[PDB]
Amino acid sequence: IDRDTEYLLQENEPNLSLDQHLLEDLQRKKTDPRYIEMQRFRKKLPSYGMQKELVNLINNHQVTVISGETGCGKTTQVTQFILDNYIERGKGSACRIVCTQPRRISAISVAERVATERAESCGNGNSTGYQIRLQSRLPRKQGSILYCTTGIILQWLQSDSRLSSVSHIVLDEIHERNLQSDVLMTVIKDLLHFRSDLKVILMSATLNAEKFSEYFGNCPMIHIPGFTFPVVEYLLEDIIEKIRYVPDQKEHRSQFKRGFMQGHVNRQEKEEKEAIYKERWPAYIKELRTRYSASTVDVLQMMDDDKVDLNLIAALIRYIVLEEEDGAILVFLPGWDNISTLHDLLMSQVMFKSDKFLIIPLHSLMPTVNQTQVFKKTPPGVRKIVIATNIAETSITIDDVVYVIDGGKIKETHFDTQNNISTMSAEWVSKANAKQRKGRAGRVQPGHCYHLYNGLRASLLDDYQLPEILRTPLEELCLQIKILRLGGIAYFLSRLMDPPSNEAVVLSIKHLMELSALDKQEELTPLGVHLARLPVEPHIGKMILFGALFCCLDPVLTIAASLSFKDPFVIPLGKEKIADARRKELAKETRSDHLTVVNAFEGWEEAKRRGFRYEKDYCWEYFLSSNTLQMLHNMKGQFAEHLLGAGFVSSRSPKDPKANINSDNEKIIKAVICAGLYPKVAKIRLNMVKVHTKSDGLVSIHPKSVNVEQTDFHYNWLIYHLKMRTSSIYLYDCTEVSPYCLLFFGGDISIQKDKDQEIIAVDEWIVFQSPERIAHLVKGLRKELDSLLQEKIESPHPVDWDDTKSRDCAVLSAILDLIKT
């Protein structure tokens, strides 16, 4: 059933006796010192001045766009303006306001900020609360504001597709162009025709907010103006000159291989622009030598385009602290790895270890609230340094920021449709992002923004980042569209504000079919309904889903985490060869790059029990990035409580013993890997080591692979996750599997005979010898599992592996028996 439907399932029932209660409470608030102090902060915001022009536009029209500068008050104020208007007109009980957020933490932290501005507690029957998935602090039924995530709304449309209890819906941060926000807009636009009463407010940062107006039929639009002080900008040349930066010698040595050998993408029109860059480079350097010292130019020539130089940021921070006037510094970094690294770099220095600095890492997976004291002001003499990702570009505003360090990089998903490769990587900011970052420094006074890219690069940046719909694989979206009965997949996507390419759509639908999430009429299978309940890429979904079904949870979640993000191995330059020997050491006899990660991870936990010296000694002698290991560990946790939500495990812990009974069985883990990586399958050529593919002919093994020199495989088949082309095609990480694993989790099953041999074909190209009875057997077992999955839709509960006679243990045990041939 559904546990997060309670604010939605209450009926909107206005009550004049509550209309009076809310208005009397409104004037007792006016006497409360906590309340008046918060009101003095609110009147300073530009939104306050426009308070009633905004509410008149909202009240006269059904769809409204509100643009404004960042920090003007959109997220925290507009809901209050609506609610307080209805209160003041004695119509308070009629207000049920829903405000969608892009991230859980936003929903929570905003609800808590708003509740303290109303001088109330959050939830507990007061005016404001939040609902995220699995966790809520709900306000009262009527006259209330609810902060939720777009994910919640999408679940809500399963039980009430008209959202009839809700009076006003506010779509926040829509300029971020998240997938979910983009489809929600399209759903909402069609809803308007059936809900005369419903009011919709779209809230966007100023840039291109007209586009949303035009998608909605040229709805009214209103801009909240703000003032930003002028900001001095600096490119890399300027920073290098100002601080006379010199990279370290003894630090930089034994540099960490990447590009092809750690598996990067290098798409089509990045290379076209990068051909422009290397052609304009000599002329740019010669020019620079006229305006900058020789040493500045010598350093810049040597700068690495791939990584953010965290030592330069550390230097630059130190210069600002010592040479510039008071003011908080804000640092923009691509992701969590760099944030914690920079943090550790700073506080490895005795200067910053003082109480005259407040150094705050800030990111979306951060615990609790933003109550971390990001917002609190520093007394004179103490300097606040905030190290963040792009969520401080628009979602969050720190008022006292005066210096902004823009690392120049942002993490983007990307998807190449011609060779069918989906990557995530650090990419250059756009001009639009760079302009938003610069503005965070002009909020209270004249500021400074230091961009870590050179003049040549600045001129070649893209003007805007592309919406995720145009660069992200579409499989999760497509499951949402059918679970919501929105109709044809391709047809619906074509109606989006920015419709995806048709090849992206066809590739995603094919993938869901090969995964058995859709049948060949493009309709949900029992398995697909469960995959849609998981907020992960479906292939990762199927794998972690079966890791719970087959009771091998802990190693599966590890592999799933590494496929989702990346493996923990690093190769220092020149140390390639002995690093390969340690990798194949961890491989033991598995013939599996995936079980290597598992062995490396399991070794790491037992090593961290034995103390730092033995743990650091481990990551060193076996070449693991302990930073990477930690995030994988944390993704394991997330995957677990994903499973907890869908009802497949009874606990939030991945090492829970009841879900781990088969975790030491190599055959079974390999079956589960196969569940998620099919149809990427290769047939090994018998006695260079090369393998046949359905896609690409004869291909080779990537040299990082524990199977690259291997000639004693014990089965004929491999599965791989990542394939990449340079001069030819190479498989990155592969795992030898039995034909019986393919036969169960694979495509359509067919039988051939003639005179000589009994043959089973899977998807017609995968052909092995075995008796025809086994084919009828797997046909039967597949249908029994389908019904196990169907009947766990309506009341999901984890399989109990301690019950003998279950009819779920019976079928899965039979399936386990079959894949153990």
- CA dist 243 to 250, 314, 322, 386, Å? 20, 11, 11, 21
User: What is the x/- site pattern for ligand ANP, positions 197-226, by CB under 6 A?
Assistant: ------x-----------------------
User: What is the x/- site pattern for ligand ANP, positions 263-302, by CB under 6 A?
Assistant: ----------------------------------------
Q: Beta strands 96-101 and 144-149: pairing type?
A: parallel
Looking at the Cβ atoms of 121 and 630, the one nearer to ligand ANP is 121
| Residue from 10, 76, 650, 653 in contact with ligand ANP (CB under 6 A) | 76
Q: Which stretch binds ligand ANP (CB under 6 A): 69-77, 256-264, 493-501, 706-714?
A: 69-77
Looking at the Cβ atoms of 128 and 394, the one nearer to ligand ANP is 394
Looking at the Cβ atoms of 206 and 700, the one nearer to ligand ANP is 206
Looking at the Cβ atoms of 77 and 296, the one nearer to ligand ANP is 77
609: three-class secondary structure by DSSP: helix
User: What is the x/- site pattern for ligand ANP, positions 701-740, by CB under 6 A?
Assistant: ----------------------------------------
Q: What is d(CA 494, CA 508) in angstroms, rounded to the nearest whole number?
A: 14
Which secondary structure element, helix H or strand E, spans residue 658, and what is its range?
A: none
Q: Which stretch binds ligand ANP (CB under 6 A): 64-72, 306-314, 454-462, 655-663?
A: 64-72
Which secondary structure element, helix H or strand E, spans residue 12, and what is its range?
A: none
| Residue from 51, 64, 68, 231 in contact with ligand ANP (CB under 6 A) | 68
> Whose CB is nearest to ligand ANP?
75
Q: Which stretch binds ligand ANP (CB under 6 A): 75-83, 274-282, 574-582, 726-734?
A: 75-83
Q: What share of the chain is helix, strand, coil (3-state, %, to 5)?
A: 45, 15, 40
Q: How many residues bind ligand ANP (CB under 6 A)?
A: 21
Residue 237 as a binder of ligand ANP (CB under 6 A): the answer is no
Residues 164 to 203: which contact ligand ANP by CB under 6 A?
172-173, 203
Angle at 497 between CA 421 and CA 74, to 5 degrees: 110
- CA dist 496 to 187, 188, 610, Å? 9, 12, 54
Question: With contact defined as beta carbons under 8 Å apart, do 203 and 173 qualify?
Answer: yes
| Residue from 109, 126, 128, 213 in contact with ligand ANP (CB under 6 A) | 109
Residue 117 as a binder of ligand ANP (CB under 6 A): the answer is no
Q: What is d(CA 279, CA 462) in angstroms, rounded to the nearest whole number?
A: 18
Contacts of 331 (CB under 8 A, 6+ apart): 313, 317, 342, 385, 386, 387, 388, 404, 405, 407
Q: What is d(CA 604, CA 625) in angstroms, rounded to the nearest whole number?
A: 11
Residue 439 as a binder of ligand ANP (CB under 6 A): the answer is no
Q: Which stretch binds ligand ANP (CB under 6 A): 68-76, 326-334, 517-525, 599-607?
A: 68-76
Looking at the Cβ atoms of 366 and 489, the one nearer to ligand ANP is 366
Question: With contact defined as beta carbons under 8 Å apart, do 147 and 129 qualify?
Answer: yes
Residue 751 C-beta: closest distance to ligand ANP, Å: 60
Q: What is d(CA 766, CA 819) in angstroms, rounded to the nearest whole number?
A: 16
| Residue from 149, 181, 397, 472 in contact with ligand ANP (CB under 6 A) | 397
Question: With contact defined as beta carbons under 8 Å apart, do 669 and 661 qualify?
Answer: no
Q: Which two tokens stand for residue 458?
A: 């600045």
Q: What is d(CA 521, CA 805) in angstroms, rounded to the nearest whole number?
A: 36
Residue 75 as a binder of ligand ANP (CB under 6 A): the answer is yes
| Residue from 74, 168, 177, 723 in contact with ligand ANP (CB under 6 A) | 74
Angle at 368 between CA 367 and CA 374, to 5 degrees: 90
Q: What is d(CA 28, CA 16) in angstroms, rounded to the nearest whole number?
A: 19
In which residue are the tokens 């006016």 written? 30
**Cα 513 to chain centroid, rounded:** 24
Residue 113 as a binder of ligand ANP (CB under 6 A): the answer is yes
Q: What is d(CA 343, CA 260) in angstroms, rounded to the nearest whole number?
A: 29
Residue 397 C-beta: closest distance to ligand ANP, Å: 4
Looking at the Cβ atoms of 81 and 284, the one nearer to ligand ANP is 81
Residue 396 C-beta: closest distance to ligand ANP, Å: 7
Q: Which stretch binds ligand ANP (CB under 6 A): 70-78, 146-154, 542-550, 749-757?
A: 70-78
Looking at the Cβ atoms of 34 and 253, the one nearer to ligand ANP is 34
Q: What is d(CA 58, CA 563) in angstroms, rounded to the nearest whole number?
A: 46
Q: What is d(CA 359, CA 378) in angstroms, rounded to the nearest whole number?
A: 11
Looking at the Cβ atoms of 226 and 679, the one nearer to ligand ANP is 226
Residue 81 as a binder of ligand ANP (CB under 6 A): the answer is no
Which secondary structure element, helix H or strand E, spans residue 162, and what is its range?
A: none
**Cα 632 to chain centroid, rounded:** 14
| Residue from 142, 394, 508, 592 in contact with ligand ANP (CB under 6 A) | 394
Bridge partners, 355 (sequence order)? none
Looking at the Cβ atoms of 139 and 555, the one nearer to ligand ANP is 139
* Among 157, 197, 193, 150, CA closest to 171: 150
Q: Which stretch binds ligand ANP (CB under 6 A): 67-75, 214-222, 659-667, 709-717?
A: 67-75
Residue 538 C-beta: closest distance to ligand ANP, Å: 31
Q: Is 407 exposed, middle or buried (0-12, 13-18, 19+ CB in 10 A)?
A: buried
Q: What are phi and psi of 693, to 5 degrees?
A: -120, 160
Residue 445 as a binder of ligand ANP (CB under 6 A): the answer is no
Residue 80 as a binder of ligand ANP (CB under 6 A): the answer is no
Looking at the Cβ atoms of 52 and 610, the one nearer to ligand ANP is 52
Residue 71 as a binder of ligand ANP (CB under 6 A): the answer is yes
Residue 110 C-beta: closest distance to ligand ANP, Å: 7
Residues 317 to 376: which contact ligand ANP by CB under 6 A?
370, 375
Question: With contact defined as beta carbons under 8 Å apart, do 380 and 424 qualify?
Answer: no
Residue 770 C-beta: closest distance to ligand ANP, Å: 60
| Residue from 298, 306, 324, 399 in contact with ligand ANP (CB under 6 A) | 399
Looking at the Cβ atoms of 57 and 649, the one nearer to ligand ANP is 57
Q: What is d(CA 168, CA 12) in angstroms, rounded to the nearest whole number?
A: 12
| Interface with ligand ANP (CB under 6 A) | 45, 68, 70-77, 109, 113, 172-173, 203, 370, 375, 394-395, 397, 399
